[PDB]
Short mmCIF file of all heavy atoms in Angstrom, two decimals:
data_model
loop_
_atom_site.label_atom_id
_atom_site.label_comp_id
_atom_site.label_asym_id
_atom_site.label_seq_id
_atom_site.Cartn_x
_atom_site.Cartn_y
_atom_site.Cartn_z
N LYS A 780 -3.77 7.50 15.81
CA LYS A 780 -3.44 6.91 17.12
C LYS A 780 -3.28 7.98 18.22
O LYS A 780 -2.42 7.88 19.09
CB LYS A 780 -2.18 6.03 17.03
N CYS A 781 -4.15 8.98 18.18
CA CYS A 781 -4.15 10.06 19.17
C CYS A 781 -4.84 9.58 20.44
O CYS A 781 -5.75 8.75 20.39
CB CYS A 781 -4.85 11.30 18.58
SG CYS A 781 -5.11 12.68 19.71
N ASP A 782 -4.39 10.11 21.58
CA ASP A 782 -4.81 9.63 22.91
C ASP A 782 -5.02 10.79 23.90
O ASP A 782 -4.84 10.63 25.10
CB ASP A 782 -3.74 8.67 23.46
N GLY A 783 -5.42 11.94 23.38
CA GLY A 783 -5.44 13.16 24.17
C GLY A 783 -6.25 14.24 23.49
O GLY A 783 -7.22 13.93 22.77
N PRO A 784 -5.88 15.51 23.70
CA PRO A 784 -6.70 16.58 23.11
C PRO A 784 -6.53 16.73 21.60
O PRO A 784 -5.44 16.48 21.05
CB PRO A 784 -6.24 17.85 23.85
CG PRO A 784 -5.35 17.38 24.96
CD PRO A 784 -4.83 16.03 24.57
N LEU A 785 -7.60 17.19 20.95
CA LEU A 785 -7.66 17.35 19.52
C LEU A 785 -7.35 18.77 19.04
O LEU A 785 -7.56 19.76 19.74
CB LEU A 785 -9.06 16.96 19.07
CG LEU A 785 -9.50 15.59 19.60
CD1 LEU A 785 -10.92 15.26 19.19
CD2 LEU A 785 -8.53 14.50 19.15
N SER A 786 -6.82 18.86 17.82
CA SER A 786 -6.69 20.11 17.10
C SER A 786 -7.62 20.07 15.87
O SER A 786 -7.51 19.17 15.04
CB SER A 786 -5.24 20.30 16.65
OG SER A 786 -5.03 21.51 15.93
N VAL A 787 -8.53 21.04 15.78
CA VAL A 787 -9.47 21.15 14.65
C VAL A 787 -9.35 22.48 13.87
O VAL A 787 -9.02 23.53 14.43
CB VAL A 787 -10.94 20.89 15.10
CG1 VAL A 787 -11.51 22.06 15.87
CG2 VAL A 787 -11.82 20.64 13.91
N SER A 788 -9.57 22.41 12.57
CA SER A 788 -9.65 23.57 11.70
C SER A 788 -10.72 23.25 10.65
O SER A 788 -10.97 22.10 10.40
CB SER A 788 -8.30 23.85 11.06
OG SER A 788 -8.04 22.93 10.04
N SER A 789 -11.37 24.24 10.07
CA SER A 789 -12.55 23.95 9.26
C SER A 789 -12.96 25.16 8.49
O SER A 789 -12.66 26.28 8.85
CB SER A 789 -13.73 23.56 10.14
OG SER A 789 -13.32 23.22 11.46
N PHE A 790 -13.69 24.95 7.42
CA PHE A 790 -14.03 26.05 6.57
C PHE A 790 -15.30 25.74 5.80
O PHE A 790 -15.71 24.59 5.73
CB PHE A 790 -12.88 26.29 5.64
CG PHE A 790 -12.46 25.07 4.93
CD1 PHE A 790 -13.13 24.67 3.78
CD2 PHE A 790 -11.46 24.27 5.43
CE1 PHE A 790 -12.77 23.52 3.09
CE2 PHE A 790 -11.09 23.11 4.76
CZ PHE A 790 -11.75 22.73 3.58
N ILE A 791 -15.92 26.78 5.28
CA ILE A 791 -17.19 26.65 4.58
C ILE A 791 -17.05 27.47 3.32
O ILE A 791 -17.34 28.66 3.32
CB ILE A 791 -18.35 27.18 5.42
CG1 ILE A 791 -18.38 26.48 6.77
CG2 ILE A 791 -19.66 26.93 4.71
CD1 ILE A 791 -19.52 26.86 7.67
N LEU A 792 -16.59 26.82 2.27
CA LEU A 792 -16.28 27.48 1.02
C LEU A 792 -17.54 27.74 0.26
O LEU A 792 -18.31 26.83 0.04
CB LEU A 792 -15.35 26.63 0.16
CG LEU A 792 -14.09 26.15 0.89
CD1 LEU A 792 -13.13 25.48 -0.07
CD2 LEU A 792 -13.40 27.32 1.57
N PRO A 793 -17.75 28.99 -0.15
CA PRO A 793 -18.95 29.23 -0.92
C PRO A 793 -18.87 28.57 -2.30
O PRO A 793 -17.85 28.59 -2.95
CB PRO A 793 -19.04 30.76 -0.98
CG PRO A 793 -17.70 31.26 -0.68
CD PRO A 793 -16.99 30.23 0.11
N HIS A 794 -19.96 27.97 -2.73
CA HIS A 794 -19.98 27.27 -4.00
C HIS A 794 -20.38 28.21 -5.18
O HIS A 794 -21.56 28.35 -5.52
CB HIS A 794 -20.91 26.05 -3.88
CG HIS A 794 -20.96 25.20 -5.10
ND1 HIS A 794 -22.10 24.56 -5.50
CD2 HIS A 794 -20.02 24.95 -6.04
CE1 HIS A 794 -21.86 23.91 -6.63
NE2 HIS A 794 -20.61 24.13 -6.98
N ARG A 795 -19.40 28.86 -5.80
CA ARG A 795 -19.72 29.91 -6.79
C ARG A 795 -19.30 29.51 -8.24
O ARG A 795 -18.33 28.80 -8.43
CB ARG A 795 -19.16 31.29 -6.34
N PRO A 796 -20.08 29.94 -9.24
CA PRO A 796 -19.78 29.66 -10.64
C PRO A 796 -18.67 30.53 -11.24
O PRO A 796 -18.31 30.37 -12.41
CB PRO A 796 -21.11 29.95 -11.34
CG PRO A 796 -21.77 30.96 -10.49
CD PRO A 796 -21.37 30.65 -9.09
N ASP A 797 -18.12 31.44 -10.44
CA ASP A 797 -17.01 32.26 -10.88
C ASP A 797 -16.14 32.50 -9.67
O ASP A 797 -16.54 32.16 -8.54
CB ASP A 797 -17.53 33.58 -11.43
CG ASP A 797 -18.13 34.48 -10.33
OD1 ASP A 797 -17.36 35.20 -9.67
OD2 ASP A 797 -19.36 34.48 -10.10
N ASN A 798 -14.97 33.09 -9.88
CA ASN A 798 -14.06 33.38 -8.79
C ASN A 798 -13.87 34.89 -8.64
O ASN A 798 -12.84 35.35 -8.15
CB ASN A 798 -12.71 32.68 -9.03
CG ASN A 798 -12.77 31.17 -8.78
OD1 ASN A 798 -13.11 30.71 -7.69
ND2 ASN A 798 -12.39 30.39 -9.80
N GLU A 799 -14.88 35.67 -9.04
CA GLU A 799 -14.81 37.13 -8.89
C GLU A 799 -14.43 37.63 -7.47
O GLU A 799 -13.97 38.76 -7.32
CB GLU A 799 -16.10 37.81 -9.41
CG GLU A 799 -16.02 38.32 -10.86
CD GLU A 799 -15.43 37.32 -11.87
OE1 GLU A 799 -16.04 36.25 -12.09
OE2 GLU A 799 -14.36 37.61 -12.45
N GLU A 800 -14.61 36.80 -6.44
CA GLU A 800 -14.18 37.14 -5.10
C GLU A 800 -12.64 37.08 -4.93
O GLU A 800 -12.10 37.76 -4.07
CB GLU A 800 -14.88 36.23 -4.07
CG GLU A 800 -14.95 36.81 -2.66
CD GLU A 800 -14.94 35.75 -1.57
OE1 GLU A 800 -15.26 34.57 -1.84
OE2 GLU A 800 -14.59 36.10 -0.42
N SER A 801 -11.95 36.27 -5.71
CA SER A 801 -10.50 36.19 -5.61
C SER A 801 -9.83 36.97 -6.75
O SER A 801 -9.84 36.53 -7.90
CB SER A 801 -10.05 34.73 -5.63
OG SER A 801 -10.04 34.17 -4.32
N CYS A 802 -9.24 38.12 -6.45
CA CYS A 802 -8.70 38.98 -7.50
C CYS A 802 -7.49 38.37 -8.23
O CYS A 802 -7.26 38.66 -9.41
CB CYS A 802 -8.33 40.36 -6.95
SG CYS A 802 -9.68 41.31 -6.18
N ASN A 803 -6.75 37.50 -7.54
CA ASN A 803 -5.55 36.87 -8.10
C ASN A 803 -5.81 35.48 -8.72
O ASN A 803 -4.89 34.68 -8.88
CB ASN A 803 -4.45 36.80 -7.01
CG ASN A 803 -4.00 38.19 -6.51
OD1 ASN A 803 -4.45 39.23 -7.02
ND2 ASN A 803 -3.11 38.21 -5.52
N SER A 804 -7.06 35.20 -9.10
CA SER A 804 -7.45 33.88 -9.63
C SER A 804 -7.02 33.65 -11.08
O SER A 804 -7.27 32.57 -11.64
CB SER A 804 -8.96 33.67 -9.49
OG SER A 804 -9.68 34.70 -10.13
N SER A 805 -6.42 34.67 -11.70
CA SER A 805 -5.76 34.54 -13.00
C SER A 805 -4.48 33.72 -12.85
O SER A 805 -4.15 32.92 -13.72
CB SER A 805 -5.46 35.93 -13.64
OG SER A 805 -5.00 36.91 -12.69
N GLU A 806 -3.77 33.91 -11.75
CA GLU A 806 -2.57 33.14 -11.46
C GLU A 806 -2.93 31.72 -10.94
O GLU A 806 -4.10 31.44 -10.61
CB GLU A 806 -1.69 33.89 -10.46
N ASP A 807 -1.91 30.86 -10.87
CA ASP A 807 -2.02 29.47 -10.37
C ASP A 807 -2.63 29.38 -8.98
O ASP A 807 -2.47 30.28 -8.15
CB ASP A 807 -0.62 28.81 -10.32
CG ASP A 807 -0.61 27.48 -9.56
OD1 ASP A 807 -1.02 26.44 -10.13
OD2 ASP A 807 -0.19 27.47 -8.38
N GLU A 808 -3.29 28.25 -8.73
CA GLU A 808 -4.01 28.01 -7.47
C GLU A 808 -3.17 28.30 -6.20
O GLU A 808 -3.71 28.79 -5.21
CB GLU A 808 -4.62 26.59 -7.43
CG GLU A 808 -5.90 26.39 -8.27
CD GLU A 808 -5.67 26.42 -9.78
OE1 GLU A 808 -4.52 26.26 -10.21
OE2 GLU A 808 -6.64 26.63 -10.55
N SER A 809 -1.86 28.06 -6.23
CA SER A 809 -1.02 28.22 -5.04
C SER A 809 -0.79 29.67 -4.65
O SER A 809 -0.07 29.93 -3.70
CB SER A 809 0.33 27.55 -5.24
OG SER A 809 1.09 28.26 -6.20
#
């Protein structure tokens, strides 16, 4: 029910078969 200016955020996650880009991916997602 917005009636004015918008706030947007967005991302383009690379679709990879491993998580070698994230060094802390051994720990929980959070």
